[PDB]
Design a protein around this ligand. Sequence first.
Ligand SMILES: CN(Cc1cnc2nc(N)nc(N)c2n1)c1ccc(C(=O)N[C@@H](CCC(=O)O)C(=O)O)cc1
Ligand SMILES: CN(Cc1cnc2nc(N)nc(N)c2n1)c1ccc(C(=O)N[C@@H](CCC(=O)O)C(=O)O)cc1
Ligand SMILES: CN(Cc1cnc2nc(N)nc(N)c2n1)c1ccc(C(=O)N[C@@H](CCC(=O)O)C(=O)O)cc1
Ligand SMILES: CN(Cc1cnc2nc(N)nc(N)c2n1)c1ccc(C(=O)N[C@@H](CCC(=O)O)C(=O)O)cc1
Ligand SMILES: CN(Cc1cnc2nc(N)nc(N)c2n1)c1ccc(C(=O)N[C@@H](CCC(=O)O)C(=O)O)cc1
Ligand code: NA
Ligand code: NA
Ligand code: NA
Ligand code: NA
Ligand code: NA
Ligand code: NA
Ligand code: NA
Ligand code: NA
Ligand code: NA
Ligand code: NA
Ligand code: NA
Ligand code: NA
Ligand code: NA
Ligand code: NA
Lengths: 265, 265, 265, 265, 265, 265, 270
Amino acid sequence: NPSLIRSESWHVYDGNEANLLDGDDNTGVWYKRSNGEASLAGEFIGLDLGKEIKLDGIRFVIGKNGGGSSDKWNKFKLEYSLDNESWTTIKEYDKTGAPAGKDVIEESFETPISAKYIRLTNLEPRHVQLTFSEFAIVSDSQVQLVESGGGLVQAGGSLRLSCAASRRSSRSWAMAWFRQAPGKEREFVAKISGDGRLTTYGDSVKGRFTISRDNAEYLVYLQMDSLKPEDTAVYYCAADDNYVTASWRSGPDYWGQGTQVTVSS
Amino acid sequence: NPSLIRSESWHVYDGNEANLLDGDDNTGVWYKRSNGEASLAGEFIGLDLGKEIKLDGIRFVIGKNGGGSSDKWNKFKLEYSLDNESWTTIKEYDKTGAPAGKDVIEESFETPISAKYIRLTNLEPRHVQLTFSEFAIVSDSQVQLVESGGGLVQAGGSLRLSCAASRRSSRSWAMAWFRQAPGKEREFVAKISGDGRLTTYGDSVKGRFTISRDNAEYLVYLQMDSLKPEDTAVYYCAADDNYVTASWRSGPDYWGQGTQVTVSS
Amino acid sequence: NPSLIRSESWHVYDGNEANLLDGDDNTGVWYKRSNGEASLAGEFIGLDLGKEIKLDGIRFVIGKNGGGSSDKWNKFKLEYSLDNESWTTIKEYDKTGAPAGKDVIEESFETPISAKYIRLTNLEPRHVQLTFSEFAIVSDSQVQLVESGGGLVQAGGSLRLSCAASRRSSRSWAMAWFRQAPGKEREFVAKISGDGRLTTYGDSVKGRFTISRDNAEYLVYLQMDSLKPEDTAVYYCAADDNYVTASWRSGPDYWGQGTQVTVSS
Amino acid sequence: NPSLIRSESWHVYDGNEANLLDGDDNTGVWYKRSNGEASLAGEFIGLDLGKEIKLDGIRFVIGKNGGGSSDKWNKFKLEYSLDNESWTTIKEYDKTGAPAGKDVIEESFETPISAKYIRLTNLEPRHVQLTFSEFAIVSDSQVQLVESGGGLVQAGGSLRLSCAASRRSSRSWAMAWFRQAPGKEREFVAKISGDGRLTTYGDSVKGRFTISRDNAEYLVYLQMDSLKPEDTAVYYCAADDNYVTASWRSGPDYWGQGTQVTVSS
Amino acid sequence: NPSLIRSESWHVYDGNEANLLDGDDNTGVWYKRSNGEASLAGEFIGLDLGKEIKLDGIRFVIGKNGGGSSDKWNKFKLEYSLDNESWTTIKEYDKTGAPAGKDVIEESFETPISAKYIRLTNLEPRHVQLTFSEFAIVSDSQVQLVESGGGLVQAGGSLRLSCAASRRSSRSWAMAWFRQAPGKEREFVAKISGDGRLTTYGDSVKGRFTISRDNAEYLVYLQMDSLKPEDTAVYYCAADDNYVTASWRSGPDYWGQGTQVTVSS
Amino acid sequence: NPSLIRSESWHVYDGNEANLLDGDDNTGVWYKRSNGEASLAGEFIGLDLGKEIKLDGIRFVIGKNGGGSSDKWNKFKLEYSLDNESWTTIKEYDKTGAPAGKDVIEESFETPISAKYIRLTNLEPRHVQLTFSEFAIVSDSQVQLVESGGGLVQAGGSLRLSCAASRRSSRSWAMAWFRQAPGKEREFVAKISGDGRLTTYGDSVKGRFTISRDNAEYLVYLQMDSLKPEDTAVYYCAADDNYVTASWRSGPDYWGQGTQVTVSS
Amino acid sequence: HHHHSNPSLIRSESWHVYDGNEANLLDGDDNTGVWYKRSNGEASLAGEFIGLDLGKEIKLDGIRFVIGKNGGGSSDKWNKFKLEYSLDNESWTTIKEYDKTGAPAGKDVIEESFETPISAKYIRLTNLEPRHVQLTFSEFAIVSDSQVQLVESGGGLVQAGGSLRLSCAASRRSSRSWAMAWFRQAPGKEREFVAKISGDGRLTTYGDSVKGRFTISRDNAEYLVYLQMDSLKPEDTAVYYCAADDNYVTASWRSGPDYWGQGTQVTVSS
Ligand SMILES: CN(Cc1cnc2nc(N)nc(N)c2n1)c1ccc(C(=O)N[C@@H](CCC(=O)O)C(=O)O)cc1
Ligand SMILES: CN(Cc1cnc2nc(N)nc(N)c2n1)c1ccc(C(=O)N[C@@H](CCC(=O)O)C(=O)O)cc1
Ligand SMILES: CN(Cc1cnc2nc(N)nc(N)c2n1)c1ccc(C(=O)N[C@@H](CCC(=O)O)C(=O)O)cc1
Ligand SMILES: CN(Cc1cnc2nc(N)nc(N)c2n1)c1ccc(C(=O)N[C@@H](CCC(=O)O)C(=O)O)cc1
Ligand SMILES: CN(Cc1cnc2nc(N)nc(N)c2n1)c1ccc(C(=O)N[C@@H](CCC(=O)O)C(=O)O)cc1
Ligand code: NA
Ligand code: NA
Ligand code: NA
Ligand code: NA
Ligand code: NA
Ligand code: NA
Ligand code: NA
Ligand code: NA
Ligand code: NA
Ligand code: NA
Ligand code: NA
Ligand code: NA
Ligand code: NA
Ligand code: NA
């Protein structure tokens, strides 16, 4: 019975992985990444077949329901292996430009390939939070902003976060990053105007951190360089219709749940 | 004039640091600790005096009013310093076995010592949740459960949590730990009987986590070893008059506000 | 003007029964009991108002500033009488689980109550040593161990004794009973470990005596069955940090002041 | 017309038997016993109805006014007879724990009962000095010390004495027994300390005689074993506010009026 | 597949016990009791599960339709077992004062419970006549007077009977008990008025038997003390709209079916 | 009848293990230890008594005579066993800062203990050279300089050495270490002023080894790091009245007898 | 009137018994003995002596003096000294000289043989150079066929402008390091801080009442503590005490110390 294998750096954010092996194209999973937002080349997801078998084709469904932010990889391969060490490329893909949403990857093997594992592997870095719906073989109430990237980092390092959304608004929004360290008040960290042209920074981070967004892909990014331990905190991303009020706790009309960042000495 | 200095990994669960300077013995702070409940040795709390000065004595009140869980260090030292790099012991205390509650620590310096900083520093690890009431120099209630510890630790590491109480019941309670990731439901994790003799675990945490209690100190503990990303959640600790019903979301008659563990990758 | 009335078989261990009517909530009385530790059903404490009056309510404070062993009844009733032979319940209470200490009992009678006497009366046997603080109506610093239950019993009879502490230690003690007839040496009787899981009994009493502890309420007990007049003696309870040494006059670090037990024939 | 009947071995001390039949709950009779202080199985008190008649209830007040020493049986039965030789039981009782003072026993019978006789009969030996206030059917300042037990006894046998008190004290009192043969002195027999921990005896009695006290019930006892004809005398009980002075004649502050003991050859 | 189990001291009056397992709330079973009417602590009714299995919940429906006499325990507890020797409590219940008739007890084990046996068990003597309607698990007309109590007893013993009814009259009745030895004629034993204020007895049970009624519960009781062999008989309970004629064979308009009582030497 | 038993890492320097069993406080034994001078926690010395027996006390003399160097553990425990596998603590001693000399550990076991073994066991490490005098149950000459450490360690490691002395001079001595391989010359290793403020090391060793001394305790130590086979030799400690002549074969006025060090590959 | 009298003990006048009594010096028991303090300076000066008065002139085959005394404690013996005798008590001929420098504390036996007898009326030990120790002794014969203790010695009386050295010795020797300190308590007044020194001797402090006049020192090898007092003054009068603390900081407070001497009286006239 086929089980799911995938890059260890991903955490499940919504949904659960059983959804991926269930036959429904409308159940899915949304993944944050653990140490920095961008999916590296090398990263993979796909399935362990239990034992060597003779595949007549496959049907993997990547991305998920919703308008929302781009959710798939750009350049990837479909590869199968017998020893989980050595892999063999069946097909390269370029989905650069693809709209957000389910994409059905349905491949057909005229000549039944024989393999114990089969997966998709990223080929180039990809700054977007990945979602997926279904993975199988052929053997004949609202809106959420979501932050991602973020874990343990060494003093003086860099780490980068990303905010994505489940639906695409028809208006422009100012986006902002705040942080809260335990038992303290939520601080302002940075904001950016809807069109990207105006940005300001809290005093603590000026120089080190950089905010930015990509509207085509529908994500916002915070780059933290030269980190310190007093940077430890949960980081929230927030959406405000008014750039002037975007750097005030009582400004953002929409908040993410936050991603925890710790910097050790 | 004088300001408080204390350990950087503590944070305030209740009341606030001005209570510890207000001149009044019944205004306190109750601290929690980030990344492990236990208070390591080297941990400290005391005064930054402002400038080099002739001290005739100190009166520190440690522990805070109430007959709940144990709120004091066991073995600690009172030391002072001019530069805040080098410290000198005035005294050493062994308060092992002291009942919870205020402890007035009063000293005269027959010989006017001269310091800029003076504090209590911890000598052996303490698995309680520290409270405090006053810190001076001389110179010429409905029941609340509280989880502590919790922070971010990387996959495969360990973290331990504790749950204190603000009042001590004359009945005997089962205790449990639940967890709840955002959006998922609240899972049962581990329960323990009144007398610590019986315990049971949930399938996923079975054999990685251990639950214990120390009734004389009135704390419950949770040791998590071999941590996984799927362990990330808010951990709540709960009490229930019935060991059977304690593993059920509706068993407990009391709950903590929770603490956050995150496992990175 | 109104005066106190209570079960006869109690006697004052500490405080005075003036403190009961004195107006002050910090003055109380600590009570041992005579022929057996446990307060039985039927036992009472209350006022005789010295004539029939109209009552708007009562305020009885029970327990007494405590941070030690349970000092209250569990199930009692509040009742009044005209002639002292008929008693009519006004309210029944169930304080099972109550932390030790003051408990204010304040009642208002929308229509007045015509009463000559009014009291708390206990409904279920209780194994604790009772304390009390104040009894009004409305119209317009270091440790003690106390033993209780001592008195006089016919040969072949039974007696139960208990021992309470005034303060509750953060460390675990083994507890032991000893006895000492006048002019004789003090002879070990029984010992129980911290967690009550280990017990051993002096050669003289094996088979007739049981030692037990309830840690939640902070009491130790000695049940004496099949007594004979050789058992007559002052009975002491004591605590030793070490169980091994608990059965030797010099092990213990704190001693009770003992209750006399006398077996006639 | 109905007259009183009761155990022969008793005999009046205070008031007289006509107060027991006067309609008044506040007049009574206080009995001493002879040939032992304790009242035994079968001892009884009740009414000779004169002639055989029908009853709808009874009302017996037992004990006498005042919160002195305990004064009622513990376990007794209410029984009646036509012929006076054999008896049938109605209710049984357990007044163990009862306060001292009047206790009313109002019974009404669903079926009328006819009888020449009806009484209360003791079921279990009771070491107390018996009082009674009133006996009726239905047909539609200074304290005071008392010695009881003892009259005539064959040499080398045993006899038990008790001493009751009429008021009860806030304070603790050493209690002593003294005897006085006509013609001679008041010889000290035995004292006991307030708590009952300390006792001393006259050399004439040491090892044959035991003093003991029941501070609950409020009574002191002298158990006397293997008596000699020179033990003959008036035995008295006294109270001294100081145990040290309690074996001297001018020590006791309160003195009973003595009870005759006589040991024939 | 699951089998019923219940107290051995019960026998069925009406109903088939498979009714308790059909999954229908409107088909039930009325039980008589074997030795005396009153259900004692520890009695029980529940399921033999066949082998050890894992429950998610249970649904038990106690009492039976018809607003007759009360038909359920007051205090009782749901408990389970692995072996039939040992029982763990899931839930204690207080239904004091609940009205006659079915009552669905539904419970849900949020984590499964492993049991082979699960039942309800009485906690306090209950003087009714128990009826029950249905027992299940989850794992992924005319009026009848009924008599009960009564089996075999030693002479001189005691035994007590009850009469229940299946429907409640708005008219108020006199009740009476009658016995008949076989061949021998039906003999009057005792009667009671509707308000219980009036009673009379058959000549031979004079003094030894007591008739009584509880109208809130709708039961009548016969207490038999001091039994004789001659008391052997079937005892019938009867309703008569007129007390005067309740003692007469041709008086009572309603009759029970009888319960055998038997006295041996 | 009883045999001695001690840690294996030890060897007799003076006296023999008969003197510890001889019943003479004045005979005794002095021990060095292998592979490291210092005494590790869990090291022990005591008695095997063949059968298990009922002990009434013990009398152990630790240290032996002389006003030489410190000769006892600081923190240790008396413990017994029946199996030689698990051990129950009886007492625990803190002898920190006792004078050198013998010390009588006499314990009286008021309720007897049955053990097959009983020993003293070290708690914290102890940089001394242990001497001992007598071990009993109850049932009813110019100076010597001694070197300790010595053994066989492997390349790249670490080994420490102690020098102690049988008496203590009022003169203040420079101390030094010297080594020699068979066939070869005796070479200066390192030297320290009497007050320790002054060191100089040999050439083949500067940076690697450390010499230190504890005057209060009267010991000198040699800490060796990164040992080479070159380092194999007997090692000698020696005292010299002039720090300057102390690095010269001819200077020193008193010599050890060496302890054999052996590094291997 | 028939008598036989043994010889009798003689020693310098400055000394005074602290522990024991001198009967012990003559009782033929090595295990009894005497501890001496000195008045008017702690330190034994050259010329100080102890020995025997023989009663009349006599013929010695030898002597056996046991100096020091049963001690694991601080140093108890002179360093350089001579054995000498006299017939008149007015002049002395040296028999033997010793250099015991470096000796352990405790009893040292000095048994001496006299191949050809020496006849004398007095024979004794005499110090040869100043010794800052606190002298004990145990027996003196001829031949014819629980808890610890700190002790302050020195001073008594000395006038204005003067000088004085005090000393503290102990009956046993701890294996922990102690800070040591001096305190004075004038009559009726409170006990006052004086000076203190770290166990290792590298740190000291003096009360302002005395800084720059007094000096606190120690000899850890010998186990004694010294207090040099210069430029004195009548207001320096007090019983002086010495004390040990495990804490150099609490050392100067009237309650930090865990051991006190019974004190030595200093009195300064002008
Ligand atoms: C559940 N418990 C906390 C509790 C119990 N056992 C523990 N055991 C350990 N080891 N650690 C703990 N933190 C711990 N905590 C409680 C429960 C109630 C009250 C309390 O005040 N209870 C009720 C019941 C008493 C009443 O009737 O008033 C009350 O309101 O007083 C205090 C603590
Ligand atoms: C021994 N114990 C009494 C005690 C312990 N366990 C019990 N357990 C039961 N079941 N019943 C008891 N009566 C009982 N009593 C103690 C011991 C110390 C202190 C205490 O307050 N001691 C002071 C003195 C020293 C200190 O600070 O540690 C203290 O502060 O601890 C209180 C109670
Ligand atoms: C006699 N009574 C039984 C009855 C009455 N009082 C009691 N009182 C007590 N305490 N206990 C009882 N068991 C008890 N039982 C009755 C009488 C009639 C009906 C009844 O249902 N009768 C018919 C006919 C009478 C009518 O309804 O007009 C009907 O219509 O149902 C029920 C119960
Ligand atoms: C205070 N000290 C005296 C001491 C220490 N260092 C000194 N140093 C110098 N230079 N001069 C001194 N006079 C001096 N005196 C002490 C203190 C205690 C013990 C002693 O015997 N201590 C304890 C500790 C040993 C134990 O726990 O048994 C004991 O009871 O024996 C000895 C010397
Ligand atoms: C060299 N010294 C050993 C000594 C000195 N300081 C040390 N210091 C420390 N830290 N550690 C040591 N082991 C140590 N050992 C000695 C030397 C002689 C005597 C001694 O008994 N000397 C002779 C000879 C010198 C004399 O006493 O006149 C004697 O008479 O006893 C004692 C200890
Ligand atoms: Na799916
Ligand atoms: Na807004
Ligand atoms: Na405060
Ligand atoms: Na519950
Ligand atoms: Na009061
Ligand atoms: Na003791
Ligand atoms: Na009367
Ligand atoms: Na008197
Ligand atoms: Na049914
Ligand atoms: Na009729
Ligand atoms: Na020996
Ligand atoms: Na030399
Ligand atoms: Na001597
Ligand atoms: Na100290």
